């Protein structure tokens, strides 16, 4: 039965020995999120926070919770130009924001830089996921800094964190719930880092939030899915495995230069982002999808 | 093709980018085993070594290889009294030793202590696997010390080592290829710790060694099977994962008292082995399968 009210439980979490009815699961989820924020000093009460929202279940749920917790949550969605997929992804995110009166920023990849993720993959040589992730992290950071946000919230859940940890162990040759802000670098927090993917999904469905069910025709996100399958196989027979795994690592145990192209932090002369888009533009000219006297002019960092 | 002779390959190891014909796989396996022994100073050339052999594919293969490498390999088999299973397991081991002129020692659990693993589990309260493993490690060590062996070789393979490592990470609340000998403690080496289970099986089949195909009605060895499934799932799509996993850990980063009952090393007053068998005898008396004036008299340690 529901541990709080004694009525019929709607959600059962063996890993925590906890069973809750719909109304108290939603409340538990929201309170536990704030418990995570407070424990790790992720946010200040009512602070402006840039929420990276893709239209999927986690970041839409995160946007909902942070709003309910009274944070000034502004969403940033990035249109990746991956066909009808990215189109629907934008619609869902827009619908969410509209029907809740939340501020939503959009960066359209194709409109800003001329190429979506598909063409970007062909032109950079990198796998689609490499160029895409690189663009996502840079743009989200850039928008945060340019719009005066101190902290960015992403919707990475426990399955995601444990998959990353697992992958690093099996494949070094191929990031913590809180990353502190530095000059040119906004802070990044993961308030959902201890919720399982199943648990975040449960919140989303019970809250009635409509998200983009379908997933990208991913390329090397097929790796994370492999890691998740392996971890969940164990989790199925041994609840709390992912939590034990991630907690165990967490509770146990470099020079940055300004990019001479855009100004943002990097370890080299020019950052991987500018280096990628330069080569993409360069190869587009040789092909020639771009005018010869065109230059990639990245938005230089304040102040 | 076979990387050594150019003829048809019989064994393909994607993880190592290596393909070999039957005759050269057998040779590669044997040479690599010696490479492991030498690298880690596991054995001295021609040294007497106690090989723990269960009749399964790994330890029978290990016994074969160590013999071929000119080591004086004496096998110790422990009869666990698990029905017809343990019976066949003993036969296979005996057959191997006979048809190769190898010295084989046998400890029959029921004959030595009065109870096989099944009854031992009911009487100790511990799961079958707990009492069984405890008995196996103690007896193998005891026989080694009592018979003047410096080093014991076990047939643990890469799948086994990586499963253990994985399990510890997911479940702390539930051991290296070489353990140095100490007073009352023989050395333990795992010369097969880098061969995958599939690779050790391949050696066994190509060498024509007959082993006990069936496995114990295991209890909590069902855990290792779960760990192996998870790891092999990744290995299937990403060769060298288990090796990367295990190597990565290995290449990165207490007071012992004499048991007042048997003399062997322990952290407490009496060791877990004596403590287990005492309680088993004690509870047998209360049941009463043993005479009241009977005492468990463990073989006290030399010198
Ligand atoms: N196109 C995008 N625009 C903005 N933010 C994004 C985008 N894609 C991902 N993010 C952020 O990055 C986080 C990780 O995304 P992802 O790699 O999709 O894992 P996920 O948990 O399966 N996706 P989601 O369910 O949407 O959070 C998401 O929670 C978002 O917060
Ligand atoms: N009954 C036994 N008697 C002697 N030695 C044993 C016995 N059981 C296990 N061992 C040793 O312990 C090692 C690990 O055994 P186990 O837990 O069965 O993993 P395994 O690799 O599946 N078995 P095997 O194929 O026989 O090595 C074996 O290689 C043997 O060397
Ligand atoms: S799946 Fe690969 S490509 Fe599709 S969005 Fe995620 S990263 Fe970019
Ligand atoms: S399976 Fe469990 S019980 Fe059967 S032998 Fe291995 S440990 Fe002892
Ligand atoms: Zn309730
Ligand atoms: Zn740059
Ligand atoms: Zn050959
Ligand atoms: Zn003892």
Curated annotation (Swiss-Prot), chains A, B:
Cofactor annotation remark: Binds 1 [4Fe-4S] cluster per subunit. The cluster is chelated by three Cys residues, the Fe with a free coordination site of the Fe-S cluster may contribute to an enzymatic role.
Record annotation: effect of changing residue 156 to A: Slight decrease in catalytic activity
Intrachain S-S bonds: none
Binding annotation for ATP: 52-54, 58, 78, 155, 160
Chain sites annotated for binding [4Fe-4S] cluster: 129, 132, 216
The protein's required cofactors: [4Fe-4S] cluster; Mg(2+)
Regulation acting on activity, per entry: Enzymatic activity may be regulated by TtuB conjugation.
Pathway linked to the protein: tRNA modification
InterPro entries listed in its UniProt record: Ncs6/Tuc1/Ctu1, Rossmann-like_a/b/a_fold, TilS/TtcA_N, tRNA_thiolation_TtcA_Ctu1, TtuA-like_LIM_N
One Pfam family in the UniProt entry: TtuA_LIM_N
Effect seen on changing residue 129 to S: Decrease in Fe content, and about 90% decrease in catalytic activity
Keywords: 4Fe-4S, ATP-binding, Iron, Iron-sulfur, Isopeptide bond, Magnesium, Metal-binding, Nucleotide-binding, RNA-binding, Transferase, tRNA processing, tRNA-binding, Ubl conjugation, Zinc
Post-translational modification note: Conjugated to TtuB via covalent linkages involving Lys-136, Lys-220 and Lys-223.
Catalytic reaction list: [TtuB sulfur-carrier protein]-C-terminal-Gly-aminoethanethioate + 5-methyluridine(54) in tRNA + ATP + H2O = [TtuB sulfur-carrier protein]-C-terminal Gly-Gly + 5-methyl-2-thiouridine(54) in tRNA + AMP + diphosphate + H(+)
Sequence position, cross-link Glycyl lysine isopeptide (Lys-Gly) (interchain with G-Cter in TtuB): 136, 220, 223
Subunit structure comment from the entry: Homodimer. Is able to form a heterocomplex with TtuB.
Role summary: Catalyzes the ATP-dependent 2-thiolation of 5-methyluridine residue at position 54 in the T loop of tRNAs, leading to 5-methyl-2-thiouridine (m(5)s(2)U or s(2)T). This modification allows thermal stabilization of tRNAs in thermophilic microorganisms, and is required for cell growth at high temperatures. TtuA transfers the S atom from the thiocarboxylated C-terminus of TtuB to tRNA.
Designated name of the protein: tRNA-5-methyluridine(54) 2-sulfurtransferase
Species, as recorded: Thermus thermophilus (strain ATCC BAA-163 / DSM 7039 / HB27)
Gene name of the record: ttuA
């Amino acid at each position: 039965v529901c541990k709080v009210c004694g009525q019929k439980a709607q959600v059962e979490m063996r890993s925590r020995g906890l069973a809750l009815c719909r109304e108290h699961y939603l409340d538990w989820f929201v309170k536990e999120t704030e418990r995570a924020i407070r424990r790790h000093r992720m946010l200040l009460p009512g602070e402006r926070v840039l929420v990276a929202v893709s239209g999927g279940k986690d970041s839409l749920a995160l946007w909902d919770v942070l709003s309910r917790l009274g944070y000034q949550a502004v969403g940033l969605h990035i249109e990746l130009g991956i066909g009808e997929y990215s189109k629907r992804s934008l619609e869902v995110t827009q619908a969410f924001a509209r029907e809740r009166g939340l501020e939503l920023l959009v960066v359209d990849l194709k409109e800003a830089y001329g190429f979506g993720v598909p063409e970007l993959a062909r032109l950079s040589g990198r796998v689609a996921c490499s160029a895409c992730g690189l663009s996502k992290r840079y743009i989200i950071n850039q928008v945060a800094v340019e719009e005066g946000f101190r902290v960015v919230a992403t919707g990475h859940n426990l399955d995601d964190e444990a998959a990353v940890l697992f992958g690093n162990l099996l494949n070094p040759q191929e990031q913590g719930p809180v990353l502190p802000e530095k000059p040119g670098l906004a802070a990044r927090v993961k308030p959902f880092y201890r919720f399982s993917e199943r648990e975040v999904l449960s919140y989303t469905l019970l809250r009635g939030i409509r998200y983009l069910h379908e997933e990208c025709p991913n390329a090397k996100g097929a790796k994370s899915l492999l890691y998740k399958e392996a971890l969940n196989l164990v989790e199925r027979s041994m609840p709390g495995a992912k939590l034990r795994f991630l907690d165990g690592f967490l509770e146990k145990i470099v020079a940055l230069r300004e990019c001479e192209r855009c100004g943002y932090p990097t370890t080299g002369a020019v950052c991987a982002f500018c280096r990628m888009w330069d080569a993409v533009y360069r190869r587009a000219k040789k092909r020639k999808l771009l005018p010869e006297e065109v230059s990639f002019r990245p938005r230089v960092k304040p102040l």
